[PDB]
Design a protein around this motif. Sequence first.
Motif, PDB file in Angstrom:
ATOM      1  N   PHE A  18       0.818  -1.209   0.000  1.00  0.00           N
ATOM      2  CA  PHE A  18       0.000   0.000   0.000  1.00  0.00           C
ATOM      3  C   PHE A  18       0.854   1.262   0.000  1.00  0.00           C
ATOM      4  CE2 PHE A  18      -1.993   3.287   2.702  1.00  0.00           C
ATOM      5  CZ  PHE A  18      -2.920   3.723   1.775  1.00  0.00           C
ATOM      6  N   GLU A  22       1.324   3.791  -3.143  1.00  0.00           N
ATOM      7  CA  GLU A  22       0.887   5.166  -3.013  1.00  0.00           C
ATOM      8  C   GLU A  22       2.046   6.125  -3.242  1.00  0.00           C
ATOM      9  OE1 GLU A  22      -2.358   5.369  -2.602  1.00  0.00           O
ATOM     10  OE2 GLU A  22      -2.051   7.405  -3.333  1.00  0.00           O
ATOM     11  N   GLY A  25       2.174   6.392  -6.959  1.00  0.00           N
ATOM     12  CA  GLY A  25       1.129   7.192  -7.573  1.00  0.00           C
ATOM     13  C   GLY A  25       1.284   8.684  -7.385  1.00  0.00           C
ATOM     14  N   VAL A  26       1.897   9.114  -6.281  1.00  0.00           N
ATOM     15  CA  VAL A  26       2.138  10.533  -6.076  1.00  0.00           C
ATOM     16  C   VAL A  26       3.240  11.063  -6.985  1.00  0.00           C
ATOM     17  CG1 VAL A  26       3.653  10.059  -4.099  1.00  0.00           C
ATOM     18  CG2 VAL A  26       2.542  12.247  -4.289  1.00  0.00           C
TER      19      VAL A  26
END
Length: 40
Positions: A18, A22, A25-26
Amino acid sequence: KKNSYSYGWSFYFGALSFIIAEMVGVLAVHMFIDRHKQLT
């Protein structure tokens, strides 16, 4: 009651995945906004 069940091993690989996904993705959005700011 007082069973002391343990969440144990590779379940934590999901929790780690996770954070890694994440952090992926940022950084994509940084690449977008910087790559678009290059053609400004």
